[PDB]
Amino acid sequence: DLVGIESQIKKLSSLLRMDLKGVRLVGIWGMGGVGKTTAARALFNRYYQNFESACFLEDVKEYLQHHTLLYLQKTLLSKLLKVEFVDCTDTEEMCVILKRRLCSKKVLVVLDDVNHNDQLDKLVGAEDWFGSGSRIVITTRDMKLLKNHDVHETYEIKVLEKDEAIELFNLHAFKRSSPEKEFKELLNLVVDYTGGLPLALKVLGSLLYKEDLDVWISTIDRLKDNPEGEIMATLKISFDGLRDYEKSIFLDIACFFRGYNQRDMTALFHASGFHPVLGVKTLVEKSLIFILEDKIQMHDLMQEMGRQIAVQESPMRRIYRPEDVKDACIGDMRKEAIEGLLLTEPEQFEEGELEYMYSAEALKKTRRLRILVKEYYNRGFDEPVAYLPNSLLWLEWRNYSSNSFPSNFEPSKLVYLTMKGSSIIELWNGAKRLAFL
Amino acid sequence: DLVGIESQIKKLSSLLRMDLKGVRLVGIWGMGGVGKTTAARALFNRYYQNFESACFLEDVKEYLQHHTLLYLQKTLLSKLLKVEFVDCTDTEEMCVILKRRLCSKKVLVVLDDVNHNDQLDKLVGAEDWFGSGSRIVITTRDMKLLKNHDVHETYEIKVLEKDEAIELFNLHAFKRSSPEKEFKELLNLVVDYTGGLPLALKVLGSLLYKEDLDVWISTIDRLKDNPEGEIMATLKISFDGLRDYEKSIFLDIACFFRGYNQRDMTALFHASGFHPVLGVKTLVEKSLIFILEDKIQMHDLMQEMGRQIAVQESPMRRIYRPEDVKDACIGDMRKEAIEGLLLTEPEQFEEGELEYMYSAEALKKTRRLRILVKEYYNRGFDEPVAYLPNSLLWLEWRNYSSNSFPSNFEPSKLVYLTMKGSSIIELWNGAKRLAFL
Amino acid sequence: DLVGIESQIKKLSSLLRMDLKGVRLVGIWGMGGVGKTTAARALFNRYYQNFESACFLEDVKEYLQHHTLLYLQKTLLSKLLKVEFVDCTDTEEMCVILKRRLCSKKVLVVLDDVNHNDQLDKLVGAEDWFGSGSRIVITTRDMKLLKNHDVHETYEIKVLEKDEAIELFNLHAFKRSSPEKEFKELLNLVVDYTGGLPLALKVLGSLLYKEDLDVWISTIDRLKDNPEGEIMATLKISFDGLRDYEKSIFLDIACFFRGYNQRDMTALFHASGFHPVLGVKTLVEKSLIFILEDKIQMHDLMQEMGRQIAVQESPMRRIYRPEDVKDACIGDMRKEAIEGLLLTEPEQFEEGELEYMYSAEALKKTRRLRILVKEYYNRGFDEPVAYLPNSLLWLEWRNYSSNSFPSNFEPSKLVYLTMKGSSIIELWNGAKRLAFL
Amino acid sequence: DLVGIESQIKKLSSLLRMDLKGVRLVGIWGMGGVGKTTAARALFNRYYQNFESACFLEDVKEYLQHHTLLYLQKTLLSKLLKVEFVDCTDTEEMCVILKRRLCSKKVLVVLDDVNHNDQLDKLVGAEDWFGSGSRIVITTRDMKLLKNHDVHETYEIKVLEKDEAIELFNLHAFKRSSPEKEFKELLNLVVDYTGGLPLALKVLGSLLYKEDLDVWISTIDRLKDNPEGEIMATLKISFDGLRDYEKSIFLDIACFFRGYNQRDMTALFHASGFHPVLGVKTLVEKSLIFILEDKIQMHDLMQEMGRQIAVQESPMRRIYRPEDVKDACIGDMRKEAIEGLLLTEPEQFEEGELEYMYSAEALKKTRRLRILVKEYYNRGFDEPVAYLPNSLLWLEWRNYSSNSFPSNFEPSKLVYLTMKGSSIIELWNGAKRLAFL
Ligand SMILES: Nc1ncnc2c1ncn2[C@@H]1O[C@H](COP(=O)(O)OP(=O)(O)OP(=O)(O)O)[C@@H](O)[C@H]1O
Ligand SMILES: Nc1ncnc2c1ncn2[C@@H]1O[C@H](COP(=O)(O)OP(=O)(O)OP(=O)(O)O)[C@@H](O)[C@H]1O
Ligand SMILES: Nc1ncnc2c1ncn2[C@@H]1O[C@H](COP(=O)(O)OP(=O)(O)OP(=O)(O)O)[C@@H](O)[C@H]1O
Ligand SMILES: Nc1ncnc2c1ncn2[C@@H]1O[C@H](COP(=O)(O)OP(=O)(O)OP(=O)(O)O)[C@@H](O)[C@H]1O
Ligand SMILES: [Mg+2]
Ligand SMILES: [Mg+2]
Ligand SMILES: [Mg+2]
Ligand SMILES: [Mg+2]
């Protein structure tokens, strides 16, 4: 029943101001699941009587997946006015027709989802196409398309809060009734799992409906292990579009470095062949990641998205889970595309797979390796390391069994190296290059 | 000519009762091929004159595969009334229009095939959208969508009986004439092969039409070996939708355990990483399996569906057929993804492949193994077993050649173990964990 | 300009007879490229004035690939009559509407391309839907769909003759002008390459248009080596539809046995796991192969279709070309899926690859082998054979270097064995089974 | 604002002449991104008032990807005249209707994008379908379709010049403002990267819009390394269509031989199994390559297209980049499909990978090899060569360490061989065949 929305009509109304002359373009930028269309619909339903004519569209992306762009703009003209479709086999005649016919009128037009600029150029991209008092609202997942246009104001919509999330989930799961004084702990766990994103609340609300308490705990365990693919598909829509390196940057951040320092992240990505100046800016642009106190923290569910995508890959390019380490010991197949590693606690193998993975002869079979992390305290059952291949960019090691680094090691454009081990005599015998740090 | 249908109009009529006031929702839940649309059509054709207006749809799934949901509900309003299409570029205005326009009327509306709840919410999901006396009929393959709605009554439609199946097949194969007193044995074999499911009778009826007796026996042999893919595609439609573990549960049940005990099945699935509380409930929900006397018996054709799907897979994850055992002896490729086994009668190999498969060195190449079944009496040409890898969850062995279990065996969260062998001195030297049984 | 067509209007007219009362169904069955639609159009254009109303469709397959079956039959009613589309969201109401409205009229209706029986049932499948004097023409690639209906007469259309093919090609290549007294030899070679099938003549006619003589010879060489994929796609349309074994039967016939004896072919296919009673009948049914003097001769272009399809396959299951033999000597990859062989002339290897292929140790790496043919006279540089694996079904060997068969050979349900070699003392030492021959 | 276009209206106007009687067909042939539709639109907008009726279409390819050809020509008739759609379920009746109805009128019709001749035949393919004074304009990517028709004149549109490219990019990047006296060097580099092709200017203009100078240099580096896939997709559209050997010819030219001599190129392609008489002619025909001073120079961006396509391939069939050489040293996988090589400067390996690649034992693992180029001066750290496999067609070697060619070398239908080495005693001991040179 539109919970927490009334606080938004004031914010949207304030941006336009409703007393200025001419045309103003406002862009609503979200996250890909947070309330965007519902907010646009609320504004439409409140102010649609002030103008001579108004129109509203949903999911222009799907509309062009079923129809043609010329047809779409054909309907828009026939919606503002009551006239029937006018024949035009050329798009440009239609653009001139919109300019010539509806210039001397005040209208409100809402766009729901756009991804490329020719959409705006063919539909609403102008300044004098509309008369005085007209308002243009464009909803999109990234502000970049808005930036190329002359959008006066923009609004970024954040996730719901604890009280609002609980209220919405309670509304969906129990529309009339109330929990039988035994679901509060489960309520807290479920809502904490999502952390805003009302789409997830809607999906889970319809799932646990007239379901006994016996299935709720199983649902918690499944959600802990499985990403609940239904929401993951809607998030996956935003993933398609990254060209060559943004996927690698996003996968690197999601798999290993979620809340690390920015400067070291840019140093790593620049030294690894990616382009942080472009990749980081556009990833922030598309609301996949956000910067908070010089960190690159993302949403909880987006991390699960990246982890699942990394898992579904025939060559294991990202090993962080313990069982994937076991699968990587086959040999001659998975070594050539390891592209990273993350050693974990050893009380899951019970046969010495962990010691073999970082052994000398195992590391000679891999040739591309950038990230290697070993984070678990030494029990007293470790072995010295020999190879340390000549391709690493990020090094993290716990207690070091060996006396010092091997003499066959070259930094090889290293970036980050911290050693928490308490047994190191000297780092190196001489003074090597250390071009980057 | 709608055989056996007259007994159903009474059952459907009784549920609504036809004398109550307000609106009542009835959900017809079937199996994916049993008569569902035909029953809905019979009810429609019998009671369509009682109401002011009525409408009927087929295969809403396909309709959205060709059109948009907004267009679909646009036609529904234009069907109840004689008015032309009304322009609305937003779905919500259309929902309000249905509520505002057709509230003060009594109508009958039938939905043929739905899969997601937003379909019902956008089309028929309400209580006061329709006037007094309105009836809503929703046909679907699973009652779960009905459960989220306030459906008053539900009806599950079962397969046809022996007499009805024979009558329908005779109608299709010989619409006017009669069998020439030589097809009765073939008639019994063909009808027994299907076992209800009038779709299979329709498919086979049109195939053996003006065909000589010489081809009938060949058809029986082909049907024994081949699953007759045409029907298998319609059943395959229901398979798509299972998220991650329901496919594994269904494949496990179809391949090995069809009529086993429920409790051991849930113990196996819970111990193997799946979620029986969710998977079993939803598989029963989607009418893929049913529970009869604490068993998990399914339909005969669904078993062939699962077996064929398991066969078409580049990594042989399910070996039950004898020739697949031969193909699994290549080595270094099929061992790493064996994920189960089923040894069969040895009078098909004639070269000792069976003894090599369970040999000591063969079992060291496989690391993931949950189910292993060996069911054939010992001729006197067997060999002792050595490895018995440390990953099994289900064990079944015939006469045991070895004296006792190897000392290198750990139960490894075992679940089921029965030994029909008559040569066992002691199970183990000591007392191990045996956490699960 | 419709060459050779006038001889067909008489044949089609004679079948209906044009003086009978009631409704008659005639089915035109072709080959998949021979003139079918053009013949139907000629009959339509000649007799469309005799009836009150008439209609004609093209490529119902494509129409349902873009529209819905309900829409298709909606247009058919609106074509016979001048009335606008009538609303009906259920197909069955539309079928009853056709029966109720157009029963008392005489019409001519032509169907262009159908593949499944529900098309005919929903559109034209009845006897009293049409009034006296109505004619139904159904064009299809296989008579099986006609057989399930009560088609009175059928006509099979064959390829064009030498004179007609030359005339049509000359019309396409030189619509006004004439060859400059130097293209006659090239004309004969090109027309001989196609051998009828006016679609191929149309494709090649538009390709060699205002092209110099220098490119013509290159075109002949390319056509000799390349199958000219454009026509191959139209033929490929018919390939899709074979379920599991018809593809294997067709590939076996195209690759090796084109003009062999029928009885041995059925013996091979029955002994190899296929079903000749079904496969051969339906392949003849779909006009892929035809029987002439107890042979299985096919069209020339269909053989190139099968050969190309066999070539495009990552596992080399059909080796007949000489360079594929070289590619099959890699080892451990191609042996496990050889599924046949055809040794050819040895003056293309010049390094002894041919002798290695049939060597003893090479044949132990293959386990599935049915067809093996060795047809080239012994120069005096051959070696004795040792293994002769225990899976063959068809054997053909030239001059035999060895004295007799190896003692480790079992017939293994052999079917065909002829030996043209002049050096054989005895076939076997004893008397083995020889279950099939 | 249509920069540089005014010089084109005169050229197009001159071809028709605008004073002749009858109908004339003019074909505009471009490159796949150069201004073609905009030029056609300019001519339309200037001369559309002279005729009774006129029509214009865009992207007929997409129109048939969403609609049917019959529907397309249905709209064309309803555009010239004001009448509503006329029912016709057969295309041929529609063609006769166009001939019968609009013959006695003068019209202007523009086709935007065609790929197959039946499009023209069904729409505009005739001479007397239109009255005196009618003009037909057909825009297409290749003149071959025009050649089959009776097109009187053709116009090929070239890329923009330096001044025009700078003006257009400045218009897109700064529509109102001007560069802040610091972007001139960046302007020159960006425009030089594209070299005409206004589509690339449009794409890059919208990307660097209100972007700081810090991101511009990163964009230059990314464009140097990445092909900017957005434009590459539009160019990729033209790639689809080449049948079997044109792709191989194009990949060979793009990867290695861009500005080489024509005659040696045709000799190589003819000797390698391709058909230069067909392949070269049609590649020039489709405006992928052009001939300049007996060279095969292409556009700069098309070379990046070919290089990227060659890179995205699981079997490395084209090794020219230095890191791909490292990836090709795995062994037993990449050797069997090397199909060419290009050795580069050795100050990128620093471990001796280059010497191993051309070593004796490495070359025995490859069996298909046509092109091998080694272009870097000998530092004094090279090794003699032994194998030189018996399959090469093109040889290029720098300073030769060995005394002479190995005695196990056969020319093997060699084509090109130049040796810049200064240490060669004799080419061969005797006189071998040397069939081709
Ligand atoms: N604050 C809220 N109150 C009530 N319902 C909400 C709220 N936020 C979201 N929803 C519901 O959850 C769903 C979320 O989709 P939403 O309307 O946000 O589209 P969207 O996220 O803009 O679409 P996309 O991001 O894919 O373009 C909607 O169906 C909406 O009904
Ligand atoms: N009892 C019956 N009498 C006569 N015909 C039947 C009977 N049952 C099924 N059929 C025929 O067999 C076919 C089975 O399809 P049915 O009408 O059951 O659709 P459905 O199974 O509801 O579709 P789905 O399950 O894919 O949603 C129908 O075409 C119907 O004509
Ligand atoms: N005898 C002929 N005279 C003139 N033209 C012909 C002749 N036979 C075929 N053609 C031309 O060659 C083409 C062959 O296609 P045809 O009309 O035979 O369709 P079809 O083969 O029935 O289609 P399909 O087999 O794919 O269903 C047609 O476009 C037709 O114009
Ligand atoms: N000289 C020019 N002046 C202004 N704008 C141009 C010029 N040339 C191209 N453009 C713009 O760049 C884009 C290039 O596309 P264009 O109009 O050339 O279509 P096209 O290349 O004919 O399409 P295709 O080649 O894919 O069939 C157009 O949108 C056009 O607006
Ligand atoms: Mg939205
Ligand atoms: Mg149904
Ligand atoms: Mg046809
Ligand atoms: Mg264009």
Side-chain angles (χ1 to χ4, degrees), chain B residues 409-420:
Chain B
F409 193 90
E410 201 46 20
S412 86
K413 64 192 321 293
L414 211 63
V415 165
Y416 174 110
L417 171 143
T418 81
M419 301 215 88
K420 294 302 221 263

PDB file of all heavy atoms in Angstrom, chain B residues 409-420:
ATOM      1  N   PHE B 409      38.441 -47.434   5.774  1.00  0.00           N
ATOM      2  CA  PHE B 409      37.108 -46.904   5.532  1.00  0.00           C
ATOM      3  C   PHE B 409      36.632 -46.093   6.729  1.00  0.00           C
ATOM      4  O   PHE B 409      36.704 -46.553   7.872  1.00  0.00           O
ATOM      5  CB  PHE B 409      36.119 -48.033   5.241  1.00  0.00           C
ATOM      6  CG  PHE B 409      34.809 -47.559   4.673  1.00  0.00           C
ATOM      7  CD1 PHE B 409      34.634 -47.437   3.307  1.00  0.00           C
ATOM      8  CD2 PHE B 409      33.754 -47.231   5.507  1.00  0.00           C
ATOM      9  CE1 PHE B 409      33.432 -47.002   2.782  1.00  0.00           C
ATOM     10  CE2 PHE B 409      32.550 -46.795   4.987  1.00  0.00           C
ATOM     11  CZ  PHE B 409      32.391 -46.680   3.623  1.00  0.00           C
ATOM     12  N   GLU B 410      36.151 -44.892   6.456  1.00  0.00           N
ATOM     13  CA  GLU B 410      35.408 -44.057   7.377  1.00  0.00           C
ATOM     14  C   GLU B 410      33.968 -43.953   6.892  1.00  0.00           C
ATOM     15  O   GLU B 410      33.735 -43.888   5.680  1.00  0.00           O
ATOM     16  CB  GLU B 410      36.021 -42.652   7.482  1.00  0.00           C
ATOM     17  CG  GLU B 410      35.687 -41.840   8.744  1.00  0.00           C
ATOM     18  CD  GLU B 410      35.812 -42.611  10.057  1.00  0.00           C
ATOM     19  OE1 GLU B 410      36.500 -43.653  10.105  1.00  0.00           O
ATOM     20  OE2 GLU B 410      35.210 -42.163  11.056  1.00  0.00           O
ATOM     21  N   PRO B 411      32.981 -43.973   7.792  1.00  0.00           N
ATOM     22  CA  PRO B 411      31.587 -43.890   7.326  1.00  0.00           C
ATOM     23  C   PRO B 411      31.314 -42.675   6.460  1.00  0.00           C
ATOM     24  O   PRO B 411      30.565 -42.780   5.480  1.00  0.00           O
ATOM     25  CB  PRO B 411      30.793 -43.849   8.638  1.00  0.00           C
ATOM     26  CG  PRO B 411      31.641 -44.608   9.596  1.00  0.00           C
ATOM     27  CD  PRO B 411      33.068 -44.313   9.222  1.00  0.00           C
ATOM     28  N   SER B 412      31.915 -41.531   6.783  1.00  0.00           N
ATOM     29  CA  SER B 412      31.791 -40.309   5.991  1.00  0.00           C
ATOM     30  C   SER B 412      30.320 -39.937   5.785  1.00  0.00           C
ATOM     31  O   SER B 412      29.788 -39.961   4.675  1.00  0.00           O
ATOM     32  CB  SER B 412      32.518 -40.453   4.651  1.00  0.00           C
ATOM     33  OG  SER B 412      31.681 -41.056   3.680  1.00  0.00           O
ATOM     34  N   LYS B 413      29.684 -39.609   6.910  1.00  0.00           N
ATOM     35  CA  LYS B 413      28.267 -39.233   6.983  1.00  0.00           C
ATOM     36  C   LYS B 413      27.389 -40.159   6.140  1.00  0.00           C
ATOM     37  O   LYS B 413      26.550 -39.728   5.346  1.00  0.00           O
ATOM     38  CB  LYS B 413      28.063 -37.756   6.612  1.00  0.00           C
ATOM     39  CG  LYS B 413      28.404 -37.328   5.189  1.00  0.00           C
ATOM     40  CD  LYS B 413      28.442 -35.814   5.063  1.00  0.00           C
ATOM     41  CE  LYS B 413      27.337 -35.153   5.876  1.00  0.00           C
ATOM     42  NZ  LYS B 413      25.984 -35.456   5.338  1.00  0.00           N
ATOM     43  N   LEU B 414      27.575 -41.461   6.348  1.00  0.00           N
ATOM     44  CA  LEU B 414      26.756 -42.464   5.685  1.00  0.00           C
ATOM     45  C   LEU B 414      25.303 -42.348   6.140  1.00  0.00           C
ATOM     46  O   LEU B 414      24.997 -41.787   7.193  1.00  0.00           O
ATOM     47  CB  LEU B 414      27.285 -43.866   5.982  1.00  0.00           C
ATOM     48  CG  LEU B 414      27.107 -44.941   4.911  1.00  0.00           C
ATOM     49  CD1 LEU B 414      27.867 -44.580   3.651  1.00  0.00           C
ATOM     50  CD2 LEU B 414      27.560 -46.286   5.441  1.00  0.00           C
ATOM     51  N   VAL B 415      24.395 -42.869   5.313  1.00  0.00           N
ATOM     52  CA  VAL B 415      22.962 -42.805   5.574  1.00  0.00           C
ATOM     53  C   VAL B 415      22.326 -44.191   5.551  1.00  0.00           C
ATOM     54  O   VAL B 415      21.643 -44.588   6.500  1.00  0.00           O
ATOM     55  CB  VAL B 415      22.252 -41.865   4.576  1.00  0.00           C
ATOM     56  CG1 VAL B 415      20.750 -42.090   4.613  1.00  0.00           C
ATOM     57  CG2 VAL B 415      22.583 -40.418   4.889  1.00  0.00           C
ATOM     58  N   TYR B 416      22.540 -44.940   4.475  1.00  0.00           N
ATOM     59  CA  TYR B 416      21.879 -46.219   4.259  1.00  0.00           C
ATOM     60  C   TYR B 416      22.931 -47.266   3.929  1.00  0.00           C
ATOM     61  O   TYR B 416      23.805 -47.027   3.092  1.00  0.00           O
ATOM     62  CB  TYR B 416      20.835 -46.095   3.138  1.00  0.00           C
ATOM     63  CG  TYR B 416      20.159 -47.376   2.689  1.00  0.00           C
ATOM     64  CD1 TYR B 416      18.820 -47.606   2.973  1.00  0.00           C
ATOM     65  CD2 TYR B 416      20.834 -48.320   1.922  1.00  0.00           C
ATOM     66  CE1 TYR B 416      18.188 -48.757   2.552  1.00  0.00           C
ATOM     67  CE2 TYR B 416      20.209 -49.472   1.496  1.00  0.00           C
ATOM     68  CZ  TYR B 416      18.885 -49.684   1.810  1.00  0.00           C
ATOM     69  OH  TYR B 416      18.261 -50.833   1.384  1.00  0.00           O
ATOM     70  N   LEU B 417      22.842 -48.423   4.583  1.00  0.00           N
ATOM     71  CA  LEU B 417      23.779 -49.516   4.331  1.00  0.00           C
ATOM     72  C   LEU B 417      23.094 -50.823   4.698  1.00  0.00           C
ATOM     73  O   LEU B 417      22.864 -51.093   5.879  1.00  0.00           O
ATOM     74  CB  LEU B 417      25.074 -49.326   5.120  1.00  0.00           C
ATOM     75  CG  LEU B 417      26.100 -50.464   5.144  1.00  0.00           C
ATOM     76  CD1 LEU B 417      27.505 -49.899   5.111  1.00  0.00           C
ATOM     77  CD2 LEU B 417      25.940 -51.345   6.377  1.00  0.00           C
ATOM     78  N   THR B 418      22.748 -51.615   3.686  1.00  0.00           N
ATOM     79  CA  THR B 418      22.262 -52.974   3.874  1.00  0.00           C
ATOM     80  C   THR B 418      23.094 -53.920   3.024  1.00  0.00           C
ATOM     81  O   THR B 418      23.402 -53.621   1.867  1.00  0.00           O
ATOM     82  CB  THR B 418      20.777 -53.121   3.514  1.00  0.00           C
ATOM     83  OG1 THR B 418      20.632 -53.260   2.094  1.00  0.00           O
ATOM     84  CG2 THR B 418      19.973 -51.934   4.011  1.00  0.00           C
ATOM     85  N   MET B 419      23.451 -55.060   3.604  1.00  0.00           N
ATOM     86  CA  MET B 419      24.355 -56.017   2.975  1.00  0.00           C
ATOM     87  C   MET B 419      23.662 -57.371   2.944  1.00  0.00           C
ATOM     88  O   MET B 419      23.441 -57.984   3.992  1.00  0.00           O
ATOM     89  CB  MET B 419      25.679 -56.101   3.735  1.00  0.00           C
ATOM     90  CG  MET B 419      26.418 -54.777   3.838  1.00  0.00           C
ATOM     91  SD  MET B 419      28.209 -54.955   3.763  1.00  0.00           S
ATOM     92  CE  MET B 419      28.481 -54.889   1.996  1.00  0.00           C
ATOM     93  N   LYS B 420      23.321 -57.836   1.746  1.00  0.00           N
ATOM     94  CA  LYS B 420      22.689 -59.138   1.581  1.00  0.00           C
ATOM     95  C   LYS B 420      23.699 -60.273   1.512  1.00  0.00           C
ATOM     96  O   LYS B 420      23.295 -61.435   1.385  1.00  0.00           O
ATOM     97  CB  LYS B 420      21.815 -59.145   0.325  1.00  0.00           C
ATOM     98  CG  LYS B 420      20.620 -58.213   0.401  1.00  0.00           C
ATOM     99  CD  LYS B 420      19.737 -58.548   1.589  1.00  0.00           C
ATOM    100  CE  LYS B 420      18.266 -58.463   1.226  1.00  0.00           C
ATOM    101  NZ  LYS B 420      17.677 -57.154   1.617  1.00  0.00           N
TER     102      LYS B 420
END
